[PDB]
Amino acid sequence: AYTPQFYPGATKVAENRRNHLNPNYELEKLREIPDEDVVKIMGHRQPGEDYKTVHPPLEEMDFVEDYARDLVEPLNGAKEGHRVRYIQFADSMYFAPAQPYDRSRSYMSRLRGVDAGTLSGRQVVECRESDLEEFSKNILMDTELFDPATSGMRGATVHGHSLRLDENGMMFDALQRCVFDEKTGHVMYVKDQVGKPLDAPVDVGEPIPEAKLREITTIYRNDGVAMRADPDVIEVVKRIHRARTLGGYIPTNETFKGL
């Protein structure tokens, strides 16, 4: 077969990107947020009540015979007809453990039937609600992909991915969904991901220490790990650029001899 690498490079940032892309790499978990608490922060449904549907179950509806379409096993949320919802994250440029394009690539490499979208200060994945909650709790929130200080589950107003951190090392928030409890040293979500207040704040653990952030971040920085210190990634990027240029000029084996 083909044993996949996942990313070029020898620095710690390249290794962390490879770890995020690797589906067989078990992400280290750093907190325990109950499923109901994740559902509460997500803010789409009330925990304990059944999922709303968009269409009848796939067994009830009638579809034409399609051999190729029936080769793919559907998600359970698809089978039950659950509606498609989203979860959104904002990542700080100051050593957040996961970054937008890294998040999107890892999502499309690790999860089934997901819709990932990448912006400079935003990253959203959409899926059927039940499976979305399952992998939001298991992978997105409990593991090292999430730091309650430098990253934040937030829709609506996202801003602060490029601003400096505040006095507690937390990313700037214009709505203040999460606040720092100095008495216990934990970050508490006082609002859900869109901004409506929660009846009971939910404890999402304590901010990751800065040394661990340096060790697990996926961003290149002059102060932590410079791209100049990783010439292998630059070489691969330049190779991709040259291959694109040569293919767009004249796509033959002769013009690709100058690769």
Partner: protein, 194 residues
Amino acid sequence: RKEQIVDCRAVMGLGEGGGLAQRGTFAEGLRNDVVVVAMSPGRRHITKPVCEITYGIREAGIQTSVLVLDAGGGIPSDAPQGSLGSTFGLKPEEAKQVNRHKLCVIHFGNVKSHIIYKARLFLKYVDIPTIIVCQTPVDMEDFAAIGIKTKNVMPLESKTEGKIVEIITGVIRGESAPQKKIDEIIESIKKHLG
């Protein structure tokens, strides 16, 4: 005609070619009669509609303080379905600095639903009569619809300890206020102050 001394703020302005005031700062006018509250030090609020009211009051013979709110832009978090874009608020020190004045003059914007809830949050902690200077024509009853004490239209269940004592419409943000608006504000202050 008496000497008027102002306690200038302790911090400088916004850069070189920018404004002269700074967000979240207070400038006491010694004898505390009127405090003008500006939502921000920006061009939309400072020296175009606010320092004009300030010099109008100071010309009328009434000492004036100017307070620039730390977070004056947006709508309060208690607004329906929360706030959007930005969150409006008032600090306890800001409230204490306001509450030592006989009267307050506060400058608001265009959208009615924003102004009503901003005034409610402001008067939740301010206990002196205030004058709302806004652009849009807002009636002195929509504030009472959400619980605000109002001179003409009181609410059954008041959620504020401050009284909206006058509403003045036609003052645009970032534009020089004509002498007629200044005269109206001065007359309202004089008749509702002493």
